[PDB]
């Protein structure tokens, strides 16, 4: 009888798998410290952390990352279809299309996680052939010989990338695989409630994550950087949004209270990319956009958020901008699917109520006195 | 902090479309009493109500019946792929992808309403595709002069129904079109409160509703009719279901604590039907069926719902088992998309939280040490 519009402090799930310190700063998954799998971790490890509990062996990672590289092809009627419309459509919708006829070719039943694996494998695979598409290049397809990170620097580019960028991307993604309750887990929990299938839930996390309210999720901030065009450019361009009542893009966040953990991590391994001189120049700007910010708005608990730098990082690595909101979609899947499998341990269905405005039992006036 | 899984009895929004009466099985439109609506409404004049508040003139209605014929035809990109896997595939698949697809193509901004009206004139073209290919006859393509049910009947049959068929079908899609916040609603609600486009909220509602603790149930209840076999074995499957703490499919419901008025409306238009001894037989059973459930769960303010009879009433229609979700969605969409019209005068995130029970601070062994 109160309503709780937006769900604000409304839990709707117990978790082990993601805890948010906003107060903070920190994240951790399964119990280890986000900071800690950066500095020592990579893909597949954090995945498999997330999908099953606990980190593997030597061994059990081994069978893991070549389960992962063998489901990486995707049908050539995906494949056409992403030809067909990679120049035209938007790549969030390309890429809800394609998950969902992925669902409809899978006629297997069963095995969450086994069609979790086939999501996390494949959808690198779809956003490049977007990419190159694109830029009227031709599909390269996955080779099933390299990690995760390095083989989608390999579809874009068409050869192996450096240690160094497959590293930086390694660390990208793994900062992008959970983030607690958000709305697209919370979509996905909706659809899985019922029994949907688990192809279902992830494009209904798709169809959420899209939305420009979301968070995270957008190229909105390197847009921004991109316009102020030159370091000595920063404060005028600053003075011109903050004056007219215009936000600076990627600072603020509804959980954190300083400093987002995943922005800290990103700026600092961002200074491993070598960079032309266009990157090196973006970043000076990010550099000082975010000091400017954090003097004026830091007092008021508005700081940079992940995608402050998220994706001036992915387009130092060769993504155009718009297709940012997929990448976040290609991590962000092994969260989805951990927080639908954990919820289905013991399944409830999610059927909220409205408060009702408005007179019950009006007559029906016929067409003819209307 | 208190775990609210499920949300039961949390509101999400203020409402005027939909009002449940769950202590007395009363369900109004806008006011309106459904048991009014379905004695002397149609498709087309409820689906103007939900979308536009009130009921049409002659003159509007004329109009709208008009621009809903107009646009029944589906895109042959979209034909080509529903043929291509009718045979084999999910409908519900199928129809989340074609929606998905509309959406891709469609990328004109804003008109809500007018997007809402192409998607619920072209469902049925789909369906009915997907019919007609399974069964390897010739699509018959909608005839613009023929109104929503009848051309939705043309279209299955390959012959103009009856007037009384007509009804039939009009009045059981009347009863489906909403049902406040259902979970399939609360998936269209979630992905519209990020600002997702309305094509990304309907292909959530699909895939929220295909579940079987959803619409997916309307085809359970008939396969379980089917399983049953014959009437004198109603007594015996019931009690052995009960027993072992199995649900009766079509029974209960989050709101409903007494007879839902749709199952009421149902079971009174589904005597109009002409039954062969197939479906006298399984309308034998399902009403042997309701009167043991009601003696029994009824104590317990477990009833049937709307899923009890419509799966039986579209099959003595003629449509395939399977359909049934799809046609569900069709009449679904005009309430889903109203209630996203309506929650976007004055949007607000959904983003809720959850309540962590895992660890924390663990260290991280690098993977030669386990």
Chains 1, 2 share one sequence.
Not at 257 to 276: F, V
Request: charged share 25%.
């Amino acid at each position: 009888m109160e309503l709780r519009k937006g769900l604000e402090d409304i839990a709707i799930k117990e978790t082990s798998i993601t805890y948010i310190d906003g107060e903070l700063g920190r994240l951790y998954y399964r119990g280890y410290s986000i900071f800690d799998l950066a500095s020592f971790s990579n893909f597949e490890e954090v995945a498999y952390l997330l999908w099953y509990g606990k980190l593997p062996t030597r061994h059990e990672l081994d069978d893991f990352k070549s389960r992962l590289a063998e489901e990486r092809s995707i049908s050539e009627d995906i494949s056409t279809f992403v030809k067909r419309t990679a120049k035209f459509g938007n790549p969030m919708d390309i890429l809800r299309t394609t998950v969902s006829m992925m669902g409809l070719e899978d006629r297997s039943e069963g095995d969450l996680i086994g069609k979790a694996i086939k999501m996390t494998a494949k959808i690198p695979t779809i956003i490049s052939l977007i990419q190159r598409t694109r830029r009227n290049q031709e599909f390269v397809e996955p080779d099933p010989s390299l990690s995760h990170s390095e083989n989608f620097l390999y579809m874009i580019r068409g050869e192996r990338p450096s240690p160094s960028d497959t590293r930086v991307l390694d660390v990208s993604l793994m900062l992008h695989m959970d983030h607690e309750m958000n709305a697209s887990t919370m979509a996905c929990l909706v659809v899985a409630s019922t029994l949907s299938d688990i192809y279902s839930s992830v494009v209904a996390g798709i169809s959420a994550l899209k939305g420009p309210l979301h968070g995270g999720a957008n190229s909105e901030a390197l847009k921004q950087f991109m316009e102020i065009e030159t370091p000595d450019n920063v404060e005028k361009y600053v003075m011109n949004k903050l004056s007219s009542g215009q936000r600076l893009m990627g600072f603020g966040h509804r959980i954190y209270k300083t400093m987002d953990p995943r922005a800290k991590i990103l700026k600092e391994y961002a200074n491993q990319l070598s960079k032309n001189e266009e990157i090196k120049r973006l970043f000076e700007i990010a550099n000082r956009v975010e000091e400017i910010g954090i003097k004026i708005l830091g007092k008021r608990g508005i700081y940079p958020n992940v995608d402050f730098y998220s994706g001036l990082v992915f387009y130092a690595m060769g993504f155009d901008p718009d297709l940012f909101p997929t990448i976040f979609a290609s991590a962000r899947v092994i969260g989805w699917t951990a927080h639908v499998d954990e919820y289905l341990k013991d399944n409830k269905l999610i059927r909220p109520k409205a408060i009702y405005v408005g007179d019950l039992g009006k007559r029906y006036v016929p067409i003819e006195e209307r």
